[PDB]
Structure 1
């Protein structure tokens, strides 16, 4: 599973200003993490219908934010997808 070590690393890699913990970019990048881990996990355990929901949920949430980004500053969005690699 994801570890503090790895996680914080993920934040750092994306934040706006050093001591920041919650900001769109971050939030996104984050799920993305969890998601990807689920993704890899659902390739096996095709029979785990349950977590697959938490998955959709995660996916919805993710998109919900992006749509917000496309709303506020596009500049960020454009940049953010490339940095993550999604609907490029």
Structure 2
């Protein structure tokens, strides 16, 4: 799954400042983690639909957050996307 150290490692990676848990960058990074993991799971297990609904919801959430970021600070958006390697 996703253990504590993995999660912490990614949080402190995208944190705007020390102590930053819930900023948009961190949220999109976490979502991206879960999404890549879950997509990997659905590469096999193609008959698991219920999990796939989860994937859909996560992707939606991420897209909404990113849309907000694009709206607010286009540079921070560009940096985030470049970093995580999303869209395309």
How far 1:19 moved relative to its partner? 1.0
How far 1:35 moved relative to its partner? 0.4
The gaps in structure 1 that reach 5 residues or longer are: none
Q: Give the TM-score of the pair, scaled to structure 2.
A: 0.97
How far 1:45 moved relative to its partner? 0.5
SS of residue matched to 1:50: helix
How far 1:87 moved relative to its partner? 1.8
RMSD of aligned residue pairs (Cα, Å): 0.7
1:85 aligned residue: 85
Offset from partner CA, 1:28-55 (integer Å, 9 cap, x none): 0001000000010000100000000000
How far 1:3 moved relative to its partner? 0.4
The gaps in structure 2 that reach 5 residues or longer are: none
